[PDB]
Write a structure and sequence with these properties.
- It is a single chain.
- By secondary structure, the protein is α/β, with parallel strands linked by helices.
- The protein is 40% helix and 14% strand.
- Strands 1-3-2-4-5-6-7 form a seven-stranded mixed sheet, sandwiched between helices.
- Helix 2 crosses helix 3 (94-105).
- Its main location: cytoplasm.
Length: 264
Protein backbone atom coordinates (compact mmCIF):
# COMPACT_ATOMS: atom_id res chain seq x y z
CA UNK A 1 0.00 0.00 0.00
CA UNK A 2 2.96 2.31 -0.83
CA UNK A 3 0.72 5.07 -2.01
CA UNK A 4 -0.65 5.37 1.55
CA UNK A 5 2.54 4.32 3.41
CA UNK A 6 4.79 6.89 1.71
CA UNK A 7 2.22 9.68 1.78
CA UNK A 8 1.93 10.08 -1.98
CA UNK A 9 0.19 13.30 -3.10
CA UNK A 10 -0.63 14.36 -6.66
CA UNK A 11 -1.35 18.03 -7.11
CA UNK A 12 -1.67 20.45 -9.99
CA UNK A 13 -2.50 19.25 -13.51
CA UNK A 14 -0.88 18.93 -16.93
CA UNK A 15 0.72 16.75 -19.50
CA UNK A 16 4.20 17.51 -18.07
CA UNK A 17 4.46 15.37 -14.97
CA UNK A 18 7.08 16.26 -12.32
CA UNK A 19 8.09 14.15 -9.36
CA UNK A 20 9.67 15.91 -6.35
CA UNK A 21 11.81 13.52 -4.18
CA UNK A 22 13.25 14.96 -0.97
CA UNK A 23 16.60 14.32 0.67
CA UNK A 24 18.09 13.34 3.97
CA UNK A 25 16.49 14.87 7.07
CA UNK A 26 13.44 16.34 5.33
CA UNK A 27 10.13 15.07 3.98
CA UNK A 28 7.94 16.21 1.07
CA UNK A 29 7.04 19.40 3.00
CA UNK A 30 10.50 20.66 2.09
CA UNK A 31 9.01 21.40 -1.36
CA UNK A 32 6.15 23.52 -0.06
CA UNK A 33 7.61 26.91 -1.00
CA UNK A 34 8.62 25.84 -4.56
CA UNK A 35 5.42 23.99 -5.22
CA UNK A 36 3.16 26.92 -6.08
CA UNK A 37 5.54 27.85 -8.91
CA UNK A 38 4.91 24.47 -10.54
CA UNK A 39 1.24 23.46 -10.11
CA UNK A 40 -0.35 25.67 -12.76
CA UNK A 41 1.91 24.13 -15.49
CA UNK A 42 2.51 20.61 -14.22
CA UNK A 43 0.99 17.61 -12.52
CA UNK A 44 3.27 17.21 -9.46
CA UNK A 45 3.84 13.91 -7.61
CA UNK A 46 5.23 14.19 -4.07
CA UNK A 47 6.04 11.35 -1.68
CA UNK A 48 8.07 10.67 1.39
CA UNK A 49 11.07 8.39 1.41
CA UNK A 50 10.52 5.42 3.83
CA UNK A 51 13.13 6.99 6.16
CA UNK A 52 11.26 10.28 6.69
CA UNK A 53 9.90 10.86 10.21
CA UNK A 54 6.47 11.51 8.57
CA UNK A 55 6.39 7.82 7.68
CA UNK A 56 5.68 5.23 10.38
CA UNK A 57 9.23 4.01 11.25
CA UNK A 58 7.99 0.50 11.84
CA UNK A 59 7.91 0.25 8.03
CA UNK A 60 11.67 0.78 7.88
CA UNK A 61 13.13 -2.66 7.06
CA UNK A 62 16.88 -2.20 7.87
CA UNK A 63 17.86 -5.10 5.79
CA UNK A 64 15.88 -4.15 2.67
CA UNK A 65 17.09 -0.50 2.83
CA UNK A 66 20.80 -1.11 3.22
CA UNK A 67 21.23 -0.22 -0.40
CA UNK A 68 19.68 2.57 -2.51
CA UNK A 69 18.20 0.11 -5.00
CA UNK A 70 15.37 -0.56 -2.50
CA UNK A 71 14.50 3.19 -2.47
CA UNK A 72 14.55 3.04 -6.28
CA UNK A 73 12.11 0.13 -6.16
CA UNK A 74 9.69 2.21 -3.98
CA UNK A 75 9.84 5.19 -6.43
CA UNK A 76 9.26 3.01 -9.51
CA UNK A 77 6.40 1.15 -7.75
CA UNK A 78 4.68 4.47 -6.98
CA UNK A 79 5.08 5.75 -10.58
CA UNK A 80 3.81 2.47 -11.99
CA UNK A 81 0.88 2.38 -9.57
CA UNK A 82 -0.04 5.88 -10.67
CA UNK A 83 0.18 4.73 -14.32
CA UNK A 84 2.61 7.47 -15.22
CA UNK A 85 4.58 6.68 -18.36
CA UNK A 86 6.93 9.62 -18.50
CA UNK A 87 8.07 12.36 -16.02
CA UNK A 88 10.75 14.80 -15.02
CA UNK A 89 12.32 14.02 -11.66
CA UNK A 90 13.72 16.59 -9.17
CA UNK A 91 15.85 14.88 -6.47
CA UNK A 92 17.65 16.44 -3.55
CA UNK A 93 20.58 14.74 -1.60
CA UNK A 94 19.94 10.97 -1.36
CA UNK A 95 17.15 11.43 -3.91
CA UNK A 96 19.58 12.72 -6.52
CA UNK A 97 21.35 9.34 -6.19
CA UNK A 98 17.95 7.55 -6.29
CA UNK A 99 17.00 9.47 -9.47
CA UNK A 100 20.29 8.63 -11.23
CA UNK A 101 19.73 4.93 -10.46
CA UNK A 102 16.07 5.03 -11.38
CA UNK A 103 16.78 6.75 -14.69
CA UNK A 104 19.19 3.86 -15.60
CA UNK A 105 16.63 1.18 -14.57
CA UNK A 106 13.76 2.80 -16.44
CA UNK A 107 15.00 5.22 -19.14
CA UNK A 108 11.47 5.20 -20.63
CA UNK A 109 10.05 6.79 -17.54
CA UNK A 110 12.59 9.51 -16.82
CA UNK A 111 12.61 12.23 -19.43
CA UNK A 112 14.78 14.70 -17.46
CA UNK A 113 16.50 14.87 -14.12
CA UNK A 114 17.10 17.91 -11.98
CA UNK A 115 19.67 17.14 -9.26
CA UNK A 116 20.12 19.30 -6.15
CA UNK A 117 22.81 18.70 -3.48
CA UNK A 118 24.00 15.96 -5.78
CA UNK A 119 27.06 13.78 -5.60
CA UNK A 120 27.94 10.31 -7.01
CA UNK A 121 30.26 9.64 -3.99
CA UNK A 122 30.83 11.53 -0.77
CA UNK A 123 34.09 9.83 0.29
CA UNK A 124 37.34 10.93 -1.24
CA UNK A 125 39.22 8.50 -3.47
CA UNK A 126 42.50 8.71 -5.51
CA UNK A 127 42.13 11.84 -7.66
CA UNK A 128 38.53 12.14 -6.54
CA UNK A 129 37.35 14.85 -4.16
CA UNK A 130 34.04 13.78 -2.55
CA UNK A 131 34.50 16.01 0.48
CA UNK A 132 34.83 13.47 3.30
CA UNK A 133 37.60 11.24 4.69
CA UNK A 134 36.84 7.89 6.32
CA UNK A 135 37.93 9.06 9.82
CA UNK A 136 35.58 12.06 9.53
CA UNK A 137 32.56 9.84 8.72
CA UNK A 138 33.47 7.47 11.53
CA UNK A 139 33.18 10.48 13.85
CA UNK A 140 29.85 11.63 12.24
CA UNK A 141 28.40 8.15 12.80
CA UNK A 142 29.66 8.15 16.43
CA UNK A 143 28.19 11.63 17.18
CA UNK A 144 24.82 10.60 15.67
CA UNK A 145 24.71 7.53 17.99
CA UNK A 146 26.13 9.22 21.08
CA UNK A 147 23.92 12.23 20.98
CA UNK A 148 21.61 12.55 17.95
CA UNK A 149 19.93 15.66 19.20
CA UNK A 150 23.22 17.56 19.66
CA UNK A 151 24.41 16.32 16.25
CA UNK A 152 21.19 17.46 14.53
CA UNK A 153 21.28 20.80 16.32
CA UNK A 154 24.75 21.50 15.04
CA UNK A 155 24.23 20.04 11.55
CA UNK A 156 21.01 21.89 10.55
CA UNK A 157 22.50 25.42 10.33
CA UNK A 158 25.67 24.04 8.65
CA UNK A 159 23.66 22.29 5.99
CA UNK A 160 21.32 25.28 5.44
CA UNK A 161 24.48 27.36 5.11
CA UNK A 162 22.89 30.79 4.53
CA UNK A 163 21.56 32.54 7.66
CA UNK A 164 17.89 31.99 6.96
CA UNK A 165 16.45 31.18 10.36
CA UNK A 166 13.05 29.93 9.10
CA UNK A 167 14.92 27.34 7.01
CA UNK A 168 17.13 26.27 9.86
CA UNK A 169 14.12 25.85 12.06
CA UNK A 170 12.20 23.85 9.36
CA UNK A 171 15.15 21.58 8.58
CA UNK A 172 15.83 21.02 12.33
CA UNK A 173 12.12 20.12 12.76
CA UNK A 174 12.26 17.29 10.25
CA UNK A 175 15.74 16.12 11.28
CA UNK A 176 14.52 15.84 14.88
CA UNK A 177 11.42 13.93 13.56
CA UNK A 178 13.70 11.20 12.00
CA UNK A 179 14.11 8.09 14.21
CA UNK A 180 17.83 8.34 15.19
CA UNK A 181 18.72 4.70 14.21
CA UNK A 182 17.07 5.22 10.81
CA UNK A 183 18.87 8.55 10.35
CA UNK A 184 22.25 6.87 11.07
CA UNK A 185 21.44 3.90 8.78
CA UNK A 186 20.47 6.21 5.80
CA UNK A 187 23.67 8.28 6.41
CA UNK A 188 25.72 5.05 6.42
CA UNK A 189 23.95 3.82 3.23
CA UNK A 190 24.68 7.13 1.44
CA UNK A 191 28.35 6.95 2.41
CA UNK A 192 28.67 3.40 1.08
CA UNK A 193 27.15 4.35 -2.30
CA UNK A 194 29.45 5.02 -5.24
CA UNK A 195 27.66 5.85 -8.45
CA UNK A 196 30.75 6.89 -10.45
CA UNK A 197 30.82 3.76 -12.55
CA UNK A 198 27.14 4.02 -13.65
CA UNK A 199 26.96 7.74 -14.49
CA UNK A 200 27.46 7.07 -18.23
CA UNK A 201 24.35 4.75 -18.24
CA UNK A 202 22.05 7.77 -17.59
CA UNK A 203 20.31 8.66 -20.87
CA UNK A 204 18.06 11.52 -19.65
CA UNK A 205 19.08 15.14 -19.93
CA UNK A 206 20.13 16.51 -16.60
CA UNK A 207 20.41 19.78 -14.78
CA UNK A 208 22.84 19.84 -11.93
CA UNK A 209 22.04 22.70 -9.51
CA UNK A 210 25.13 24.23 -7.85
CA UNK A 211 25.06 26.78 -5.03
CA UNK A 212 27.95 28.98 -3.78
CA UNK A 213 28.89 26.52 -1.04
CA UNK A 214 27.47 23.23 0.17
CA UNK A 215 29.01 21.59 3.23
CA UNK A 216 28.34 18.08 1.77
CA UNK A 217 29.26 18.71 -1.85
CA UNK A 218 32.54 20.30 -3.03
CA UNK A 219 32.34 22.66 -5.94
CA UNK A 220 34.24 20.35 -8.20
CA UNK A 221 31.57 17.59 -8.00
CA UNK A 222 29.18 19.49 -10.26
CA UNK A 223 31.79 19.59 -13.11
CA UNK A 224 32.59 15.93 -12.49
CA UNK A 225 28.85 15.15 -12.92
CA UNK A 226 28.64 17.28 -16.11
CA UNK A 227 31.71 15.39 -17.57
CA UNK A 228 30.47 11.90 -16.73
CA UNK A 229 26.66 11.74 -16.79
CA UNK A 230 25.57 10.12 -20.00
CA UNK A 231 22.81 12.53 -20.96
CA UNK A 232 22.99 16.07 -22.11
CA UNK A 233 23.97 17.85 -18.86
CA UNK A 234 24.14 21.43 -17.74
CA UNK A 235 25.24 23.02 -14.47
CA UNK A 236 22.91 25.73 -13.24
CA UNK A 237 24.46 28.01 -10.68
CA UNK A 238 22.33 29.64 -7.92
CA UNK A 239 23.79 32.80 -6.23
CA UNK A 240 22.92 31.60 -2.79
CA UNK A 241 24.69 29.47 -0.14
CA UNK A 242 23.71 26.05 1.19
CA UNK A 243 22.62 22.45 0.63
CA UNK A 244 18.82 23.04 0.78
CA UNK A 245 18.02 25.92 -1.60
CA UNK A 246 14.38 24.72 -1.81
CA UNK A 247 14.13 25.67 1.93
CA UNK A 248 16.46 28.67 2.00
CA UNK A 249 16.03 30.26 -1.51
CA UNK A 250 12.85 28.81 -2.96
CA UNK A 251 12.03 31.56 -5.49
CA UNK A 252 15.57 31.51 -6.84
CA UNK A 253 15.46 27.72 -7.20
CA UNK A 254 11.97 27.98 -8.73
CA UNK A 255 13.56 30.04 -11.59
CA UNK A 256 15.75 27.07 -12.48
CA UNK A 257 12.95 24.58 -12.07
CA UNK A 258 10.49 26.41 -14.27
CA UNK A 259 13.19 26.86 -16.98
CA UNK A 260 14.35 23.23 -16.81
CA UNK A 261 10.82 21.84 -16.74
CA UNK A 262 9.59 23.97 -19.67
CA UNK A 263 10.23 21.31 -22.36
CA UNK A 264 11.32 17.69 -21.97
Amino acid sequence: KLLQILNVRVVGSGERVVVLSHGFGTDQSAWSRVLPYLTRDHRVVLYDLVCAGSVNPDHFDFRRYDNLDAYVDDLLAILDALRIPRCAFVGHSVSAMIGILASIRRPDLFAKLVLIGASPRFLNDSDYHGGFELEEIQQVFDAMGANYSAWATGYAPLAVGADVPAAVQEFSRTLFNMRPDISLHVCQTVFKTDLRGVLGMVRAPCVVVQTTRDVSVPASVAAYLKAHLGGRTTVEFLQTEGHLPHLSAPSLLAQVLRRALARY
